[PDB]
Design a protein around this motif. Structure first.
Motif, PDB file in Angstrom:
ATOM      1  N   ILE A 174       0.842  -1.188   0.000  1.00 51.21           N
ATOM      2  CA  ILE A 174       0.000   0.000   0.000  1.00 51.21           C
ATOM      3  C   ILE A 174       0.880   1.242   0.000  1.00 51.21           C
ATOM      4  O   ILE A 174       1.918   1.291   0.673  1.00 51.21           O
ATOM      5  CB  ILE A 174      -0.956  -0.018   1.204  1.00 51.21           C
ATOM      6  CG1 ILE A 174      -1.563  -1.413   1.368  1.00 51.21           C
ATOM      7  CG2 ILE A 174      -2.046   1.028   1.030  1.00 51.21           C
ATOM      8  CD1 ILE A 174      -2.822  -1.445   2.205  1.00 51.21           C
ATOM      9  N   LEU A 201      -1.665   5.010   3.264  1.00 57.26           N
ATOM     10  CA  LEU A 201      -1.621   4.469   4.619  1.00 57.26           C
ATOM     11  C   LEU A 201      -1.577   5.581   5.660  1.00 57.26           C
ATOM     12  O   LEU A 201      -2.253   5.499   6.692  1.00 57.26           O
ATOM     13  CB  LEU A 201      -0.416   3.544   4.776  1.00 57.26           C
ATOM     14  CG  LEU A 201      -0.682   2.050   4.604  1.00 57.26           C
ATOM     15  CD1 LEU A 201       0.584   1.249   4.846  1.00 57.26           C
ATOM     16  CD2 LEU A 201      -1.796   1.596   5.529  1.00 57.26           C
ATOM     17  N   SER A 213      -5.777   5.803   6.697  1.00 59.79           N
ATOM     18  CA  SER A 213      -5.819   4.673   7.620  1.00 59.79           C
ATOM     19  C   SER A 213      -7.121   4.636   8.407  1.00 59.79           C
ATOM     20  O   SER A 213      -7.621   3.553   8.728  1.00 59.79           O
ATOM     21  CB  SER A 213      -4.628   4.724   8.576  1.00 59.79           C
ATOM     22  OG  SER A 213      -4.287   3.427   9.028  1.00 59.79           O
ATOM     23  N   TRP A 227      -8.387   0.289   1.146  1.00 56.31           N
ATOM     24  CA  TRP A 227      -8.895  -0.930   0.516  1.00 56.31           C
ATOM     25  C   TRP A 227      -9.949  -0.576  -0.535  1.00 56.31           C
ATOM     26  O   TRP A 227     -11.140  -0.830  -0.363  1.00 56.31           O
ATOM     27  CB  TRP A 227      -9.490  -1.924   1.525  1.00 56.31           C
ATOM     28  CG  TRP A 227      -9.010  -1.857   2.938  1.00 56.31           C
ATOM     29  CD1 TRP A 227      -9.615  -1.211   3.975  1.00 56.31           C
ATOM     30  CD2 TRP A 227      -7.864  -2.514   3.489  1.00 56.31           C
ATOM     31  NE1 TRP A 227      -8.900  -1.399   5.131  1.00 56.31           N
ATOM     32  CE2 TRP A 227      -7.820  -2.198   4.859  1.00 56.31           C
ATOM     33  CE3 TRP A 227      -6.863  -3.328   2.953  1.00 56.31           C
ATOM     34  CZ2 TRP A 227      -6.815  -2.665   5.699  1.00 56.31           C
ATOM     35  CZ3 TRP A 227      -5.866  -3.790   3.790  1.00 56.31           C
ATOM     36  CH2 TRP A 227      -5.850  -3.458   5.146  1.00 56.31           C
ATOM     37  N   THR A 249      -3.538  -9.840   0.384  1.00 50.71           N
ATOM     38  CA  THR A 249      -3.653 -11.231   0.806  1.00 50.71           C
ATOM     39  C   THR A 249      -2.875 -12.157  -0.122  1.00 50.71           C
ATOM     40  O   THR A 249      -2.185 -13.072   0.342  1.00 50.71           O
ATOM     41  CB  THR A 249      -5.124 -11.642   0.864  1.00 50.71           C
ATOM     42  OG1 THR A 249      -5.896 -10.573   1.420  1.00 50.71           O
ATOM     43  CG2 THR A 249      -5.296 -12.879   1.726  1.00 50.71           C
ATOM     44  N   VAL A 284       0.463  -8.821   9.123  1.00 51.87           N
ATOM     45  CA  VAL A 284       0.694  -8.460   7.728  1.00 51.87           C
ATOM     46  C   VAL A 284       1.167  -7.016   7.688  1.00 51.87           C
ATOM     47  O   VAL A 284       0.441  -6.105   8.108  1.00 51.87           O
ATOM     48  CB  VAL A 284      -0.569  -8.649   6.876  1.00 51.87           C
ATOM     49  CG1 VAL A 284      -0.369  -8.054   5.493  1.00 51.87           C
ATOM     50  CG2 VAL A 284      -0.925 -10.119   6.780  1.00 51.87           C
ATOM     51  N   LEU A 322       1.350  -3.943   6.027  1.00 48.87           N
ATOM     52  CA  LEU A 322       0.705  -3.273   4.903  1.00 48.87           C
ATOM     53  C   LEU A 322       1.667  -2.352   4.167  1.00 48.87           C
ATOM     54  O   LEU A 322       1.506  -2.121   2.963  1.00 48.87           O
ATOM     55  CB  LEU A 322      -0.504  -2.477   5.389  1.00 48.87           C
ATOM     56  CG  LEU A 322      -1.714  -3.271   5.876  1.00 48.87           C
ATOM     57  CD1 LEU A 322      -2.770  -2.326   6.417  1.00 48.87           C
ATOM     58  CD2 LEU A 322      -2.277  -4.126   4.758  1.00 48.87           C
ATOM     59  N   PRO A 330       4.594 -10.621   5.265  1.00 46.76           N
ATOM     60  CA  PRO A 330       4.084 -10.917   6.609  1.00 46.76           C
ATOM     61  C   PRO A 330       5.172 -10.713   7.655  1.00 46.76           C
ATOM     62  O   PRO A 330       6.268 -11.266   7.545  1.00 46.76           O
ATOM     63  CB  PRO A 330       3.667 -12.387   6.514  1.00 46.76           C
ATOM     64  CG  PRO A 330       4.562 -12.951   5.470  1.00 46.76           C
ATOM     65  CD  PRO A 330       4.812 -11.847   4.476  1.00 46.76           C
ATOM     66  N   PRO A 387      -8.867  -6.210   8.614  1.00 47.22           N
ATOM     67  CA  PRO A 387      -8.855  -5.195   7.545  1.00 47.22           C
ATOM     68  C   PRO A 387     -10.134  -4.383   7.449  1.00 47.22           C
ATOM     69  O   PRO A 387     -10.076  -3.182   7.159  1.00 47.22           O
ATOM     70  CB  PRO A 387      -8.618  -6.034   6.284  1.00 47.22           C
ATOM     71  CG  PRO A 387      -7.883  -7.231   6.769  1.00 47.22           C
ATOM     72  CD  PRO A 387      -8.433  -7.531   8.131  1.00 47.22           C
ATOM     73  N   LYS A 413      -9.219  -0.344  12.081  1.00 48.63           N
ATOM     74  CA  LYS A 413      -8.246   0.423  11.326  1.00 48.63           C
ATOM     75  C   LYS A 413      -6.872  -0.239  11.429  1.00 48.63           C
ATOM     76  O   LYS A 413      -6.581  -0.932  12.409  1.00 48.63           O
ATOM     77  CB  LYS A 413      -8.182   1.862  11.836  1.00 48.63           C
ATOM     78  CG  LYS A 413      -6.997   2.163  12.742  1.00 48.63           C
ATOM     79  CD  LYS A 413      -7.294   3.304  13.701  1.00 48.63           C
ATOM     80  CE  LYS A 413      -8.017   4.445  13.005  1.00 48.63           C
ATOM     81  NZ  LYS A 413      -8.408   5.518  13.959  1.00 48.63           N
ATOM     82  N   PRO A 414      -6.021  -0.071  10.417  1.00 49.84           N
ATOM     83  CA  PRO A 414      -4.668  -0.630  10.499  1.00 49.84           C
ATOM     84  C   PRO A 414      -3.897  -0.040  11.669  1.00 49.84           C
ATOM     85  O   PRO A 414      -3.979   1.157  11.951  1.00 49.84           O
ATOM     86  CB  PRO A 414      -4.043  -0.239   9.157  1.00 49.84           C
ATOM     87  CG  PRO A 414      -5.203  -0.042   8.246  1.00 49.84           C
ATOM     88  CD  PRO A 414      -6.291   0.528   9.100  1.00 49.84           C
ATOM     89  N   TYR A 470      -0.773   1.326  13.532  1.00 43.47           N
ATOM     90  CA  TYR A 470       0.475   2.006  13.217  1.00 43.47           C
ATOM     91  C   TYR A 470       1.423   1.877  14.400  1.00 43.47           C
ATOM     92  O   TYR A 470       1.096   2.303  15.513  1.00 43.47           O
ATOM     93  CB  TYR A 470       0.218   3.474  12.884  1.00 43.47           C
ATOM     94  CG  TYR A 470       1.469   4.307  12.747  1.00 43.47           C
ATOM     95  CD1 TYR A 470       2.467   3.951  11.853  1.00 43.47           C
ATOM     96  CD2 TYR A 470       1.647   5.456  13.503  1.00 43.47           C
ATOM     97  CE1 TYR A 470       3.609   4.710  11.721  1.00 43.47           C
ATOM     98  CE2 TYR A 470       2.787   6.222  13.377  1.00 43.47           C
ATOM     99  CZ  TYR A 470       3.765   5.843  12.485  1.00 43.47           C
ATOM    100  OH  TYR A 470       4.905   6.602  12.356  1.00 43.47           O
ATOM    101  N   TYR A 528       2.556   0.341   9.014  1.00 42.66           N
ATOM    102  CA  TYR A 528       1.189  -0.020   9.353  1.00 42.66           C
ATOM    103  C   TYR A 528       1.006  -1.526   9.227  1.00 42.66           C
ATOM    104  O   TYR A 528       1.630  -2.171   8.380  1.00 42.66           O
ATOM    105  CB  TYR A 528       0.198   0.709   8.449  1.00 42.66           C
ATOM    106  CG  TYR A 528       0.028   2.172   8.785  1.00 42.66           C
ATOM    107  CD1 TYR A 528       1.002   3.100   8.444  1.00 42.66           C
ATOM    108  CD2 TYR A 528      -1.110   2.626   9.435  1.00 42.66           C
ATOM    109  CE1 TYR A 528       0.848   4.438   8.746  1.00 42.66           C
ATOM    110  CE2 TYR A 528      -1.272   3.962   9.740  1.00 42.66           C
ATOM    111  CZ  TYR A 528      -0.290   4.863   9.394  1.00 42.66           C
ATOM    112  OH  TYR A 528      -0.451   6.194   9.698  1.00 42.66           O
ATOM    113  N   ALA A 571      -1.878  -4.989   9.543  1.00 42.11           N
ATOM    114  CA  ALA A 571      -3.242  -5.489   9.476  1.00 42.11           C
ATOM    115  C   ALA A 571      -3.320  -6.847  10.166  1.00 42.11           C
ATOM    116  O   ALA A 571      -2.349  -7.330  10.752  1.00 42.11           O
ATOM    117  CB  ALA A 571      -3.725  -5.577   8.026  1.00 42.11           C
ATOM    118  N   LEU A 619      -5.014 -12.834   7.663  1.00 43.91           N
ATOM    119  CA  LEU A 619      -4.897 -12.813   6.213  1.00 43.91           C
ATOM    120  C   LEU A 619      -3.873 -13.817   5.706  1.00 43.91           C
ATOM    121  O   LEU A 619      -3.859 -14.121   4.508  1.00 43.91           O
ATOM    122  CB  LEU A 619      -4.515 -11.412   5.739  1.00 43.91           C
ATOM    123  CG  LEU A 619      -5.494 -10.275   6.024  1.00 43.91           C
ATOM    124  CD1 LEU A 619      -5.061  -9.018   5.291  1.00 43.91           C
ATOM    125  CD2 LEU A 619      -6.903 -10.670   5.631  1.00 43.91           C
TER     126      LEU A 619
END
Ligand SMILES: Nc1nc2c(ncn2[C@@H]2O[C@@H]3COP(=O)(O)O[C@H]4[C@@H](O)[C@H](n5cnc6c(N)ncnc65)O[C@@H]4COP(=O)(O)O[C@H]3[C@H]2O)c(=O)[nH]1
Ligand SMILES: Nc1nc2c(ncn2[C@@H]2O[C@@H]3COP(=O)(O)O[C@H]4[C@@H](O)[C@H](n5cnc6c(N)ncnc65)O[C@@H]4COP(=O)(O)O[C@H]3[C@H]2O)c(=O)[nH]1
Ligand SMILES: Nc1nc2c(ncn2[C@@H]2O[C@@H]3COP(=O)(O)O[C@H]4[C@@H](O)[C@H](n5cnc6c(N)ncnc65)O[C@@H]4COP(=O)(O)O[C@H]3[C@H]2O)c(=O)[nH]1
Ligand SMILES: Nc1nc2c(ncn2[C@@H]2O[C@@H]3COP(=O)(O)O[C@H]4[C@@H](O)[C@H](n5cnc6c(N)ncnc65)O[C@@H]4COP(=O)(O)O[C@H]3[C@H]2O)c(=O)[nH]1
Lengths: 343, 343, 343, 343
Positions: free
Chosen positions: A231, A236, A240, A248, A258, B131, B133, B138, B168, B172-173, B175, B182, B184, B188
């Motif tokens: 991203i 981000l 966010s 997304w 994913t 994950v 982002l 990962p 997701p 929210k992601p 931080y 960031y 998630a 996933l």
């Protein structure tokens, strides 16, 4: 004593790089060894494929040379991805139906591989990774290298090729009348079918390989210009706290993250395991990254002549360069793999 | 001679069944062995989790008992998932922002383990999946069981706990200031952290356990009542030729199928690896499926007053039933695990 | 016995990645070795820089740590590259004047290294590349490690730093009053000074190290997140028959191709020379291509808070990962380099 | 032992000086040694070239005399650089399409070496430096003096010669069908192919020359009346705060300064390396500079009758003078070089 595995990733049009590299490797073997009628599929004890890598995996498994597949790839790529529907890849067309059609894809494989040959007629082991949308589980089409396999013997190779290439957005799901189930890509679960390829030799191909360790397993993973998805930092850092519309964007960023994270993970366990036994050299990965200017052009389904030339040029360049430097790449073609005789 | 791994899946509120089963197991050991204040996390050499499993794994390793986690879960679940936000999951709300809030979830984790404890203070090995982002790869938060680790020693456990639980769509992601990246949900990638849990012992935990092989590894995977998601036959047959609006509903079908198929794939890899090694009692999996008439009520983000009872009832029921029958389940708690002293 | 060279490429704001990587490389050494006030410039016998890499190279040789330089980078980045100038980068503002004032860059270097210190007041050897616009030749400011050097012993370090950072399009050429010659960006000659750094040790640095060979030379080239520039295949295929306006847009493509190819070339001869002598492990390169999504955001002159987080995050991530894996990276900081006594 | 390298710089029509000097040297060897059929390419173990230097390098390596190349140079120079296109170099023509055409250049090369000879047919080693516009890296066409080479063996010499002569502003990029990559002038990375020539003998040509050192390497770099480009002191003083209109005069001054500085750099490291071992006599450079008033007429693409006489006159003049004085120049043509047979 030694087991060679060929793993092909899924990249759609970018599979032209996968086949151009293999075709260019075929010509190098003929020129340097002064031989003829060289097929790249005779040096591997197992050929693992996924999405467009699965279609090429079936072609090499039957006995066709990579050059013949490359020739069919060039003419068919325009028919599989017409320019009339590429320009109509916008929101309200996608919201109504899947873009493109499966019939041009179906005919391309029919000339490439046939319409009657089944997995029991193959003299080479193959894997075609796919997911079963009807049950939610991944279904792996494979030749009966396990004597107790009673499911994939009489499917048809064209059914497996169409199943693994039925992209969730780019194509309609593939219905196999024999199995009465719908299927999608194996890239949903394994875009890089290299780790799962090693697993099959260790636990399932024991009738042919009673003593198989990861040290005796060599993997030649030919990528499809793997895109390192992430991203954007501005999105981000700014969006966010938003949802869907901003962060997304529709479902796009969730699935792409994913896919990329799952694809990275399977490569990571593949890499992490090999350093544990200090046999990292057994894994030969031939892939590069698309430059930023070329990245916006070379997409998953771009059949324009300019990018087709770029994919062919990258494959020819990478094949010649890696052959000169990577000695392990040259060791795959020293001897011909024994043919697979079903038990 | 023997290595024990506790693996916890991610299900949201359904993780109460994971901690209720562990809480009831703690009481059973106390009642039968005639002991006091037993810790369910003191019998495992490595605790790994994802999403709600990660939060429970972090709490268990910090020294807090599962019973303390059980009562903390009950009160906080009503705060983490408010009724007003749960009832307000219309499409326009998800299209405008992320449902629920991260502040109530932050308070619940802080009240249980704190806001200053880092991975270098833990006396129990921990593996948390997430994950990244910002990069797409990962990121796996873990205690420094491998002395060469130099990244996660000064990151607060509340940072990893909030990162792995950042669904997701439902959150929210997260931080992380110490990393400027960031994160998630870890579901996933590794919603069932069972296969990767064995890999860590054979790859990264070689210091404490030099001669570690899967024959010496026992895994206790406690599920969170995960349903076998699949596309409905009526939708598949009637709408295989449509897109987004009908088939692959917006993006949920693509994402949900990807997670369960990957979760199935990782579970399949563990089952196939264990089946070949002629040992399968090592993998003790305690999971069940919600009845169809009750699956419309027990949702991953629905709490109510009955679903709390339903998940607790399943935890107490399954804890007693499998303890009486599964002998290998009882062998997990026969001896306390050695403390983890970082090198 | 062993000579260590630190090479710093030039990337503008991307040097924040270079300094963030050096910042936590200091932190990891401070942790694991349990030291304090560690200086990363004391482990290198020669520091080579270019553009933003040159400015950081001069600061490190002043006896200052990378963390202090990192703090000044964050505050001055929004001052060296104001948002108002960043937004106004059209053609009318590019053909009428240079975009980005040079005074804010002047103060940032002055506040860190000073304004009166000269190359004779340095205890660490330094190389700063620059292009002498008045004579059309590369001028390399360097400390008098060669006792016969009688040219730049009395030139302020702020003049060399200001000259090497004068990007031809962004920053106006720097007039050195002591030499009466105008200078431009040092990235027009050697944007990767890793190769020329080895040449200096073998050719001029013969007084401190009488017996120097590339076998006993270790290079730690910290990248600038450099993009592998290339012309888009769509533009090459369709517009190779046009001129300037279509192909080689104004002049941007010619300069970028010339600099990227030259940077690739100097990198290549470094690799070929080390490959021939079987000492490829001596060259430790820590660089990573930006993803395609991040490429449109992390430009050469963007100092937005989103881009700063990503550049800091990438440096934080890379420093910890490479230290764990790359053993040769750890061997750089085993011993402190002897101070340079001017002669 | 001794190794001889011939290096020819680019420059276009000014290469008439390069071929006239070689032609006059051929006649001098015939006249004083009292022999016949002297080929200047038979006295060198490697011929390095770029742009017009590369075209002459391929002709000499093919086996043809410098006089034969010189004869075709005078006839073809007028058609390669027509006067109608030479005088029509206004901005509105350059902004629309590239000046000149590559067809007359194609026929001139075809009439000299042919259209079917390939790099595997040559009995003399050669370089052809070029810029791979499709990838951004520099591509060096060369004969298989390294037995592991597999890329350039089946490439026609006319394709490599036309690739290196594709001056970005003057000639359209050359599209090689066999490689599917576009190429530009090799003078973007090396206008003086001397330093890279010594590297090859020490790196790639280790099979024919196992014990190869720069001490035993003799270089005869024939210039192309190279001009020491620099920005006018009035411009650097009057317009140093302007941009792209008064300074840099569009992109022309940036690319010219970058090319000359890189050419200066490669010569600089060549002189510095030879000075290090006190073998400066091994480098024989035969070049001068055009006078100020003459240079306003003698350009890189001036094919006027007066300009051709001056270039021919300079070549005849310098050939006799340097032969009389430079003893090292005479030592080059003392023994014929061993022919190169691919392994
Ligand atoms: N693939 C396959 N399975 C067959 C065949 N004949 C009988 N079976 C049986 O059907 C089961 C389910 O097949 P699937 O491909 O639908 O699911 C597979 C597939 O989703 C996954 N899988 C298969 N090979 C894999 C591999 N090499 N790596 C990773 N995952 C793999 O694990 C599932 C279970 O494999 P299994 O070998 O324990 O059980 C097989 C196997 O015992 C047959 O011809 N092919
Ligand atoms: N996770 C982690 N990595 C650390 C730490 N200190 C240093 N590192 C290094 O950073 C690399 C990447 O970290 P990541 O966790 O973000 O990516 C990880 C994670 O995405 C995945 N991974 C790690 N352990 C795994 C496991 N046991 N099972 C499955 N996947 C696993 O593989 C990646 C590469 O692992 P690696 O051990 O070769 O390299 C590490 C490792 O060398 C640390 O504290 N934690
Ligand atoms: N750089 C420098 N040169 C000095 C000094 N005192 C005297 N000089 C002399 O000035 C000449 C030209 O300096 P320059 O930096 O403008 O050009 C330099 C620079 O453009 C380049 N160069 C020097 N060292 C290099 C290196 N290590 N790698 C690549 N290029 C290099 O070669 C040119 C000639 O170097 P040289 O050592 O033969 O001659 C020096 C040297 O003899 C001094 O303090 N610094
Ligand atoms: N030149 C060349 N390379 C070939 C051939 N067959 C296989 N290769 C391989 O392709 C790689 C890239 O070739 P390139 O000419 O496009 O880039 C080259 C060129 O840009 C540069 N280079 C090569 N020789 C050089 C030299 N002598 N001096 C300076 N730069 C040189 O370094 C790059 C990498 O060289 P390498 O020998 O490590 O790798 C080769 C080499 O291993 C072949 O016939 N010619």
């Amino acid at each position: 004593s030694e087991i060679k595995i060929l793993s092909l990733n899924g990249g759609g049009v970018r599979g032209l790089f996968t086949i151009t590299l293999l075709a260019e490797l075929e010509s190098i073997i003929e020129k340097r060894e002064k031989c003829e009628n060289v097929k790249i599929g005779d040096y591997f004890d197992l050929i693992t494929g996924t999405a467009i890598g699965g279609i090429l995996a079936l072609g090499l498994a039957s006995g066709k040379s990579a050059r013949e597949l490359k020739e069919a790839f060039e003419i068919n790529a325009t028919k599989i991805f017409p320019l009339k529907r590429f320009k109509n890849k916008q929101w309200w067309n996608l919201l109504r139906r899947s873009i493109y059609e499966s019939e041009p894809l179906y005919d391309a494989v029919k000339s490439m591989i046939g319409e009657t040959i089944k997995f029991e007629d193959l003299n080479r082991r193959v894997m075609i990774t796919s997911v079963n949308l009807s049950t939610g589980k991944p279904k792996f089409f494979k030749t009966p290298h396990n004597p107790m396999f009673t499911m994939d013997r009489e499917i048809r190779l064209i059914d497996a090729a169409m199943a693994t290439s039925a992209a969730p957005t780019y194509f309609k799901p593939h219905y196999i009348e024999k199995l009465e189930n719908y299927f999608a890509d194996g890239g949903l679960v394994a875009n890089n079918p290299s780790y799962i390829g090693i697993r099959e030799v260790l636990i399932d191909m024991k009738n042919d390989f009673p003593d198989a360790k990861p040290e005796n397993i060599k993997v030649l993973n030919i990528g499809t210009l793997s895109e390192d998805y992430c991203i954007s930092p501005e999105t981000l850092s700014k969006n966010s706290g938003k949802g869907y519309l901003s962060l997304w964007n529709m479902g796009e960023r969730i699935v792409l993250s994913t896919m990329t994270a799952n694809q990275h993970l399977q490569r990571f366990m593949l890499l992490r395991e090999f350093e544990a036994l200090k046999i990292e050299k057994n894994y030969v990965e031939i892939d590069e990254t698309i430059p930023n200017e070329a990245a916006a052009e070379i997409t998953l389904d771009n059949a324009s002549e300019g990018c087709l030339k770029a994919l062919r040029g990258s494959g020819k360049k990478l094949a010649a360069e890696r052959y000169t430097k990577n000695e392990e790449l040259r060791n795959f073609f020293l001897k011909k793999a024994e043919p697979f005789v079903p038990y």
